[PDB]
RNA sequence: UAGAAGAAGUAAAUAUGUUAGGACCCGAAAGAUGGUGAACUAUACUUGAACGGAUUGAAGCCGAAGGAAACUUUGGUGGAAGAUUCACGCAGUGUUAACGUGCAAAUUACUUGUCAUAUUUGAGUAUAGGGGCGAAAGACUCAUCGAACUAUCUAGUAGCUGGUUCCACCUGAAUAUUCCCUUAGGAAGGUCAAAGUAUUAAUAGUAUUGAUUGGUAAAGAUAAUGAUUAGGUGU
RNA sequence: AUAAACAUACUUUGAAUCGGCCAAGUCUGGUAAGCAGGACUGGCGAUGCGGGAUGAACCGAACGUCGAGAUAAAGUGCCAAA
RNA sequence: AAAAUGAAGACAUUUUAACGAGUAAGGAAACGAAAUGGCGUAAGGACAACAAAAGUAGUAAAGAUUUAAAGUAAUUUAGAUUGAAACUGUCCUUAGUGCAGAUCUUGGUGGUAGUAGCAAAUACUAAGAAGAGGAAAAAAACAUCUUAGAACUGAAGAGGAGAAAGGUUCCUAAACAACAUUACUUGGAUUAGGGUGAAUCGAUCCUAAAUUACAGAUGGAAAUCCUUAAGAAAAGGAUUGAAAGGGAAUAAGAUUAAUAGUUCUUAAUCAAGAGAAAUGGUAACAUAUCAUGAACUUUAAAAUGGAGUGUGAAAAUCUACGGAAGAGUUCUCUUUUCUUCUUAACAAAAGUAAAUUCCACUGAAAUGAAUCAAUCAGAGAAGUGGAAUUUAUUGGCUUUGUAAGAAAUUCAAUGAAUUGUGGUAUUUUUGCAGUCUUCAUAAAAAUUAAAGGGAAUCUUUUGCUCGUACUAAUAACCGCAACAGGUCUCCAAGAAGCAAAAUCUUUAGUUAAAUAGAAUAACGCAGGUAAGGGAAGUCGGCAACAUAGCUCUGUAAGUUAGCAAGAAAGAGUAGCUCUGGUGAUUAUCGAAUCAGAACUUUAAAGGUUAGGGGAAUCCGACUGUUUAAUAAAAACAUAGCAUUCUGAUAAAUCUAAAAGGUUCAUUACAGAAUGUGAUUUCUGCCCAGUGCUCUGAAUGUCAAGGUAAUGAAAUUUACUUAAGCGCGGGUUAACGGCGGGAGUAACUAUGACUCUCUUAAGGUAGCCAAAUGCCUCGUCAUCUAAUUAGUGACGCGCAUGAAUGGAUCACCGUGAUUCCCACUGUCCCUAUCUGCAAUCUAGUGAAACCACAGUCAAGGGAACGGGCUUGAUUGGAACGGCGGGGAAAGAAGACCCUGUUGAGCUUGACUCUAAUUUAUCAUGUGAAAUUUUCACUCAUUUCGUUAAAUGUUAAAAAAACAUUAAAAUUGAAACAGGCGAUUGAAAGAGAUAGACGGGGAGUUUGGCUGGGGCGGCACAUCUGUUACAAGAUAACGCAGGUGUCCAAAGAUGAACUCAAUGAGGACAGAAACCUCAUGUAGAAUAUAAGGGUAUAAGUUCAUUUGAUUAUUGAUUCCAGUACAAUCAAUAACUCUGAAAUGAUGGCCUAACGAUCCCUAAGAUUUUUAAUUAG
RNA sequence: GGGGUGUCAGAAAAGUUACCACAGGGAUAACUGGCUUGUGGCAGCCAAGCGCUCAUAGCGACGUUGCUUUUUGAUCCUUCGAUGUCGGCUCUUCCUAUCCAUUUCAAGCAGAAUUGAAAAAAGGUAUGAUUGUUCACCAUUUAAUAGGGAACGUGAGCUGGGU
RNA sequence: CGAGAGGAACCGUUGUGUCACGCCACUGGAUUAUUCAAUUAUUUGAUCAAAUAGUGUUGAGAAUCUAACACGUGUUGAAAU
């Protein structure tokens, strides 16, 4: 048959990201001595709206500690930040909302966000709206600490991985029911080309494996092995279970 | 069962037959390989352009009256909605109207619908052939799409259809049998023609006489195997 | 007994063909069929001519170009020779 | 065919006799008594006046047209005419050698046929001019130009201009052969000239989506990737990308046959050049350059959605007062109706605005201030006084310079006159202020300015390159064209009206845009009306009719409480003369809007524009999308609901590969993959089967490898190995599924109830003759006079049913169905009106189709003749209609079947394959347990930065600033052979091996057949019969049979006689066992049927293995091939019998099988060599 | 010799196309026509009986002989380089196996209403609800509301309801 | 005729329906004699007179055509069956 819609998605055609009005890459600043063995102070100049993402972005401004000028950064807002607030980033920073601390200095039970999976990689985990990761325990024997990811999974990271103390702003975004197809159309203004999704059973046998006959149905089980080739991998993949959960 | 038994073969020009090659001439739907295309249409992005008149009246706000309170009744203000309609436009529901060698290789008239946010639209730009694009009809990808266009392989193959060019003279057929992936076709064989021989235990789709073979027509039915209507005699 | 020397025996090479159809003092399946399928022979196909008004097969009889006569099937009131 | 003659005659000899039809097919050449005979086309080698000028030809070749002759024919010969330079006859040789067909190719030409047509876009007329081109017994029409009449587009135009595209189509002159469906003096047509002027408009400059280089990386290759990451490359990152984004700077008048923000006059602007460092104000802030301001850093501008309301200013229209000039009307009036009364870029500052934001004084409550709405205040309202910015250039409007000298309107014959002031009116444009809305927040750079810091100590010149004409469309672009189709924009008057609607008009444009004139038939296309009845027409109210604006009253069931709703329904509306309400300025001035009252009439929305309404059922929730060119929908989307995987070095996924690419400028409120389709109510039972999964088991089965053994070695053998499958569990909002019989309640039904077969579970809640029910037009009500229709019920429901979603409908729908009211030519049943055609004429002028053609009946025939046979009957040429025929035209039937012809799609069809997966190999160091587990980093992976303090020693009050160092190489500490982390000898890419893999590639899907399919095997095969007394022999003809069975059921010898019947014998009888008699097979013989058999071929007894080896010759199917079977002998060794004999499987007719490949048995009877003796 | 090809002189082989394509076919089906007439329709002969008596007013069993092509069968002769395939609407003609009107005979014909039969096809034979329907069934009206053919009459005559 | 219930026919007279042929007097319908009149919108300065809205529209509307809507004729005679 044809190449299904999932195959056509990996080619980088019209399915490219609609990132033209985006503000930029949101991350911590690059690690240095003044962050490893001191604290640098940042000023939250403004809080802006980055298209395509649900959380506001803070236009933080630091001072260059080795040369003359400014280090205009772009952080992800923690809930409660306000314009003109001072935020301190470093190993000796105080445990306040918005401060950037290595994950080893946070007491067990601290709620953090924008955590680095690897030291110095400028933020990976807990970046969506209203999300956060909790610190579970420390292990000074091998300099590793345990955190609980927003998916519930537990992850062990190095004790010098940085994080922002608090909650990502914009929580409760997905609790408001979209009511109209027009509203969902505007949701993907700064996203990829995915929205109007035709059911595979409404397709033809050439287009999709579900492309059916005289009655709209599937015909074969929709739970498939992980090793299925691209093209026939349509439906539920490696499904340990199905049906409504109890 | 091949051979020998006082060697016959060879060469070249023709004719006929078999075989391979374009193969008596014309004919597929297809397959592969390499290139050209988004000036039509499909979707996406960048940068521009285009809402005039009415209908209805959501929160929010203000007065009056009633109330212990919660608040309620009533009159305004406000101008929301993928709200209702008209217009410039656009589409194509009906007439299954006109036309149907047309104005037109899809148009015209009235009617109908729709007529700014899932809107309409120009330019630039991106996506290309077992690929793209698709609010999904196998739809669209330059009047070409259930796999575009163009050139080469390629005069592709065809047991199938059509055609196959001067005269006179002589001879003149076939539908049995065996085998086939065989049943619209082949090979062995029968019928036929043309060449070339042999003095030749090498004549007969006939009748007669003679010795035979057979089990058909007929015939039989307490003659064998069966089928079937009755009438006497005896126990 | 009759016939047979352009008799007889062939040898070699090869063409086309194996869709058939009709008749009947014949048969089988079928109610039956201008149906389907067979035995024997003769025909049409490959075939014109005279007759049946006309007709692939029926009847007479098979064909170089003509003249004259006797005929065959069948006919002789007119079309139409008698 | 036979005789006779026979070197040359000639006619392919002479005589006699017999014969001669023919499709497919054959008879090549030569061959004297000739093994068929000849004609024609073209070229090659010879021959052609025999006596030394040797075929024909300017005294007319070839060719063409005909007249005659010869030949059975193919053809040849000659004359005449035309033609004017080459050609012919015979013999061999050679071949691109003979045409009526191929829907044949190319070219030309007929009938149709002077036929169909030259009918959308309202429309032309008179006089004159030019011209060959309005003549004439009306030849009724006449192209271009001027004037007059009459008209249309109607200012979202048939107007004035651009982008794309076109490319000279632009202007003028000469000229009309061709072209614009007649004509043309016209033309976007022919010929020849002319025409496009920029410092200010654009391109050029910048960047957006995106695009492309050197080096690097990848690739067998072409080439691909990377775009600043990999680089000794580029303070920081290369090229291209916009005539609609950003952008230094120009206007008015005049001018040309044509160019003008481009030329001329006048008047401007811009850029690049040349000739210890200021005041004022309390403050917000202000000063014709002034009044210094480097490196470095920051801020702002360029540069930012949309809606709606209010309002400032300008312009257009309208209007008030005063006029000046011209024009129209005027025997009826009209102090009247119409036109003109204007002003640029750039600057100035008499006078004077609206809105917003700040500053100073003061301190608000009895809270005030304010808007159409809002909104605001002790982080300070209101008040008073100030400052700033915006308002199409300076500074918004009037005004001024430019500047009246221009331009407009008149007058005179170049010269003269005038060029006030307003509006609480409408529209457009351009700004401003707040309000609303987003799970949408609505570009970048070139370039410019300011700030922080304090390093250093007016005149004039020039402004280059390219585009510039014209159309921009009912004739310049794309559709074959002057095509009713398509194609992005700017400016935009009056009436009337809610309206940029319909209708009419002014400025501008045009009267031609594929020809007309006469007549006024039929049938048409477009627009209409109609008596009485009112859907009776019809599949169906299809088409048409009908309602239609505004004001007031009134408005149901149902409902998601928002709607339904313009529900439904009723009344009013004209003209004229009046009355009253709604304000501003302080009596004057002004706005369209509402209400009311007399009177009149032809009783009033209706010229134009302008909803038909109601009661139900089904589907989809809605707005939206869809098969360009027959399907617009119930289909797709949708929001909502639900499920699966993934912690980013991941999931999905593109690529041959890749420091490769997409979601991802991302991070579970995320990314990817699916089903159902709003809301309400609810989603029942089933894990057996197939999927998926497991956090799971070991010693069932499992590869290449590894190890070990024997052997001279290859080889062989044994043991051990991962995933996978198997074993066990989970999962259905995973694929899916969700029974049968019988009996029983005081009449008749029905069966609450038991019985028992059975499943993984037995269809649960619901719903129903449903868009789902065969029977079926189900049964009962209701709708109608009448109901295969609709609706409401019943439900053992062929074959309803729960996210393949079940039930439910409020609003909504160019969706499907039924019924009412109203209205009507749908109909009873047709009449009639208009325009354009059709008819005839002048000019002009095709196409489809065509074997030849064209009166009937019957017969026969290929079973439906125009032709043939027999009759009926006919006068030649035809015009307007017409739709019976020509089995009319269009198209190698698209339905069905046959091809050993395909293609799309599907699947544990066969054979493979990319992706996925598992094991082994590919040697980093240092150790411990029985190779595994450890520790490190050094290859390797994944990352981050300006490779910016690594390692080891040493010593949360404040949205503000931080840089170019003083001082004495320090100030500002040293070293490591690690830029910093992460993984790490594991993972990746390679090879080999196992699994999985319709994601993908290639191919196949027998035959016979009263069409094919389903059924059956008449396909290999035997018996009886059809079957016709030799042989052969049909049907999907009839009655049946085979794919075996047998160490005895083979061989032999001997003995015996069978089935049945009668008569006897204790139990014993109809049937037990014994005896006699009769007994032609009526028994038995493995089997289907038919044959054979009595001292047997049957039963019993006994021996036995001939059911063996080797070699020949025949018979049956037969093609006289193979296989198979049937026989006759010979040479061995044997069995049985006294022996003759018999025995090479079964009493006979069926019981079966090639090439290649695999796998067993056999080849010692004999021949050699060497060595002794002769 | 054995291992086998059963499609048995012996390929290694699953479906579906209503999206379909090509070479062909009347060697071959779906429609008319043609032969046949089982089936359908109509008509006869005999006379066991019914018809209160009476085989034949009216019927006529058990048997038996025909005709028709208006049903469906049976066949495959023509058409596969195409004969436009149902019904309805409009219109003409033809058959008689006559429904009415005309003329007659018979009856178990008293009258009226009827029933059987002969001459006769010149003239008439309707309006609607439901269904695409042919067919059917209802409600009326009429003197009667008969049955059929013409390529199952009639698509360059219409419609497009069904297929 | 019949017990009764019920219950005809021939001649004669008069009408209706349909079919066919006609016809325009009376009744009705169409009507671009854009006839006569009225009137909405636009434009002629107003009155008069018109024009435009492809026939602006409405009322009456002759002629001509026509009726299933008006009205006439086919009641008609001999012979042979």
UniProtKB/Swiss-Prot annotation:
Q: Primary place of residence?
A: cytoplasm
* GO terms classed as biological process: cytoplasmic translation
The record, for InterPro entries, names: NA-bd_OB-fold (IPR012340), Rib_uL2_dom2 (IPR014722), Ribosomal_uL2 (IPR002171), Ribosomal_uL2_arc_euk (IPR023672), Ribosomal_uL2_C (IPR022669), Ribosomal_uL2_CS (IPR022671), Ribosomal_uL2_dom3 (IPR014726), Ribosomal_uL2_RNA-bd_dom (IPR022666)
Which Pfam families does the protein's record reference? Ribosomal_L2, Ribosomal_L2_C
Q: Which GO terms describe its cellular component?
A: cytosolic large ribosomal subunit
Known partners and oligomeric status: Component of the large ribosomal subunit.
User: Could you say which protein family the record assigns here?
Assistant: Belongs to the universal ribosomal protein uL2 family.
What is the protein name for this chain?
Large ribosomal subunit protein uL2
Biological source species? Entamoeba histolytica (strain ATCC 30459 / HM-1:IMSS / ABRM)
């Amino acid at each position: 048959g044809r190449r299904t819609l999932s195959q056509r998605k990996g080619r980088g055609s019209i399915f490219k990201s609609r990132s033209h009005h985006k503000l930029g890459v949101a991350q911590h600043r690059a690690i240095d001595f003044f962050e490893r063995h001191s604290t640098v102070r940042g000023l939250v100049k403004s809080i802006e709206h980055d298209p395509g993402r649900g959380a506001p972005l803070a236009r933080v401004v630091f001072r260059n500690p080795r040369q003359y000028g400014l280090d205009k950064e772009l952080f992800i807002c923690a809930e409660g930040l306000y314009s003109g607030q001072y935020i301190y980033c470093g190993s000796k920073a105080s445990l306040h909302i918005g401060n950037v601390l290595p994950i080893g200095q946070c007491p067990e039970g601290t709620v953090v966000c924008n955590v680095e999976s690897k030291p110095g990689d400028r933020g990976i985990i807990a970046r969506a709206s209203g999300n956060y990761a909790t610190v579970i325990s420390h292990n000074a024997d091998n300099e590793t600490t345990r955190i609980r990811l927003p998916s519930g999974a537990k992850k062990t990271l190095k004790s010098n991985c940085r994080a922002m103390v608090g909650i990502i702003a914009g929580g409760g975004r997905t609790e408001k029911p979209i009511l109209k197809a027009g509203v969902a159309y505007r949701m993907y203004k700064a996203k990829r080309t995915t929205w109007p999704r035709v059911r595979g059973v409404a397709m033809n046998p050439v287009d999709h494996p579900h492309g059916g006959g005289n009655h709209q149905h599937v015909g074969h089980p929709t739970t498939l092995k992980r090793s299925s080739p691209p093209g026939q991998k349509a439906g539920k993949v490696a499904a340990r279970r199905t049906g409504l959960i109890r």
